[PDB]
Amino acid sequence: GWVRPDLGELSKVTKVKTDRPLPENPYHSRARPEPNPEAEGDLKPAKHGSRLFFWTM
Amino acid sequence: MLKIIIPTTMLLPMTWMSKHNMIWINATVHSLLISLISLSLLNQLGENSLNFSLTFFSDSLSAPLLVLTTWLLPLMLMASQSHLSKETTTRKKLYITMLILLQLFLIMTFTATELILFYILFEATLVPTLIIITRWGNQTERLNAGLYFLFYTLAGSLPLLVALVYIQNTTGSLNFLIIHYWSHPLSNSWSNIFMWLACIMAFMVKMPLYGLHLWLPKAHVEAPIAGSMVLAAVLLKLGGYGMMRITTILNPLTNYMAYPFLMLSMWGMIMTSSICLRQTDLKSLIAYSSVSHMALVIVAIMIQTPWSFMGATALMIAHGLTSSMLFCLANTNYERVHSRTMILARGLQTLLPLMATWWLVASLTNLALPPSINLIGELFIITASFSWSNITIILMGMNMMITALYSLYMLITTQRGKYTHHINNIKPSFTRENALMALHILPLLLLTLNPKMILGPLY
Ligand SMILES: CCCCCCCCCCCCCCCCC[C@@H](O)O[C@H](CO[C@H](O)CCCCCCCCCCCCCCC)COP(=O)(O)OCC[N+](C)(C)C
Ligand SMILES: CCCCCCCCCCCCCCCCC[C@@H](O)O[C@H](CO[C@H](O)CCCCCCCCCCCCCCC)COP(=O)(O)OCC[N+](C)(C)C
Ligand SMILES: CCCCCCCC/C=C\CCCCCCCC(=O)O[C@H](COC(=O)CCCCCCC/C=C/CCCCCCCC)COP(=O)(O)OCCN
User: Fold this and answer.
1) What stretches pass through the bilayer (chain B) (predicted)?
2) DSSP-derived secondary structure for A1-57
3) Fewest CB within a 10 Å sphere: which of A25, B151, B314, B388?
């Protein structure tokens, strides 16, 4: 009683009912390094200007 | 300080918007008025300074130099009026522009609260002088002279810049007040020795130091009269002013490092005074006399005692005035005889008696006759040197004797004796020349009445 699969059926993406657990770390990665501080604030004018040599602004 | 800087800047559009035959009158009048305004900087304090702003400050060392700089421009214009007669209006305006730019740079240099700003203006003064020398000089050597006057200067000044920025990378500032208040001793190290040399050599070359004085005779001889006046009166004093400012960070290393320069100056004053005795050119003799006087000023600054500093300030002012007068007298002779050879035109007393009186008074002030400010500075420096070491008196007295000898030799050769027979184009002295001579000499004899105005901040 076997019916031959039609064109376009064996190439389908199907779902699998499995009871095997999903690997939590399949890549065996290390812990990612901590990011840079990402400072935030509200801008204020540069103190006493550019402070480059004799320039007062 | 802007109440002096802005009018000096306005001198330029006024010069360039003037009539073709009003440039000299307008320039002279407004430069005299600027001098009169600048005369009010002389009201100095016994305390710190006249700190106008973050950029400019005045001091009783800076104020006499500023007033002399402002006073020199009208005299330079009066001296230049004669030999620029046959030249186009645009070129005369350019010449006056060069003089005005030189005054502006000198004024900003002498106040210059910042050391880098001081360096920038102190090197910006180089360009107008070089253009004046190499454009409106007469002989073919002027170009060569200009080259010397350029490269010597830069050969000294390029290391200084490096040193300067290095200091600000360590101290954090180059403001003179902060430097003075936060000064610290220099340890005896090779790095500190080379920092000392980089700080000193730039100002030493423009005094000039005896071994480094080759550029001065060329530059002063080949320059026009205004160029010679500004070179001898103000530009030579930039080195002394810079040393007086910068020696505050060089202690106690100055005690050891001063010896070669002290020996060079003490022997070179004798050498240059002796050179003056055998000179066939008036301008070269006056230039070598300037070298001797600046050698004495170098000794005074290196000793770094209160009397040394007062004498050096007084001598700088007096030498500026006297050398400008001497160059003007030489140029009055030259514009008649066109030779600049001292032995050629002789016995000019019998033909120009008032000019002979001017020659006599100029020689007397160069000779350091008391109670002139020339002798005030001379004696203060000599006493400080005697306290430094009693053996300096031999060299100092020998220098005094040779100075008197060559001054009176210069007077006798040109004014006394018999007139040269074949020279018949010696015209009577103009009112312009006599006025120029009086405007040189009355300030000296009038400053001898109030010496504290030119004795500096340690008075
Ligand atoms: C032709 C023959 C002679 C005829 C004339 C006869 C008369 C001669 C008299 C004049 C000379 C004699 C000397 C006597 C001096 C008397 C006046 C003197 O005593 O006053 C001086 C005063 O004069 C000044 O001190 C000196 C003048 C300053 C000179 C400034 C130069 C002018 C600017 C020009 C540009 C600068 C070029 C140089 C740059 C450095 C000193 O006074 P002082 O005891 O102290 O205090 C003043 C009064 N107080 C007490 C109220 C304060
Ligand atoms: C030419 C016209 C004039 C131009 C300007 C002339 C002025 C420049 C003179 C330079 C000032 C002095 C330079 C060095 C002074 C240091 C003291 C030295 O002379 O004494 C001895 C120094 O010993 C020897 O000198 C070592 C160096 C030897 C090599 C130097 C070359 C000698 C002649 C070079 C002169 C050429 C000058 C021009 C170069 C282009 C003491 O030895 P020591 O107590 O243990 O070490 C002291 C230094 N410490 C403490 C920092 C460690
Ligand atoms: C009229 C012509 C004269 C030509 C110039 C004369 C002046 C020469 C002075 C030296 C020039 C450069 C000096 C450097 C400027 C100052 C900087 C400084 O002091 O820093 C020193 C650096 O010192 C140096 O590097 C000096 C090296 C000099 C190399 C060039 C030599 C030039 C000729 C040397 C012989 C002649 C010296 C005196 C000549 C006088 C003029 C005749 C220490 O800093 P650090 O090293 O970072 O700290 C120490 C711990 N690491």
Assistant:
1) 21-41, 61-80, 92-110, 116-133, 145-167, 193-216, 223-244, 256-277, 284-303, 309-330, 351-369, 389-412, 433-449
2) -PPPP-TTTTT--------SPPPS-TT---PPPPPP--------PPTTTT--TT---
3) A25
Q: How far apart are CA B258 and CA B237, in angstroms?
A: 19
Resolution of the structure in the document, Å: 2.7
Closest CA to B343 of B272, B418, B427: B418
Chain B residues in contact with A56 by the CB 8 A cut-off are: 54-55
Chain A residue nearest residue B173, CA to CA: A53
Spatial separation of the C-alpha atoms in residues B123 and B153, rounded to whole Å: 9
Which technique was the structure solved with, according to the deposited record?
cryo-EM
As a whole number of angstroms, the distance between CA B51 and CA B395 comes to 41
CA of B29 to the centre of ligand 1 (A): 24
Q: How many other CB atoms sit within 10 Å of the CB of residue B68?
A: 23
Which residue from B55, B168, B174 is facing A56, i.e. has the nearest CB? B55
Give the distance, in angstroms, between the CA of residue B422 and the centroid of all CA atoms in the same chain: 37
Location of structure tokens 């005779």: B217
CA dist B173 and B121 (Å) reads 18
Which is nearest to B416 in space by CA: B363, B337, B338?
Answer: B363
CA distance B24 to B34: 15
CB contact under 8 A, A53 and B55: no
Closest CA to B328 of B296, B297, B295, B361: B361
Q: Look up residue B105 and give its two tokens.
A: 């740079």
CB contact under 8 A, B116 and A53: yes
A57 interaction partners in chain B (CB closer than 8 Å): none
Question: Within 13 Å and on the Cβ side, how many CA atoms surround B305?
Answer: 15
Distance CA B412, CA B348 (A): 10
**Tokens read off for B17:** 């918007």
Contacts of B191 (CB under 8 A, 6+ apart): none
Tokens for B189, please give them.
């190290």
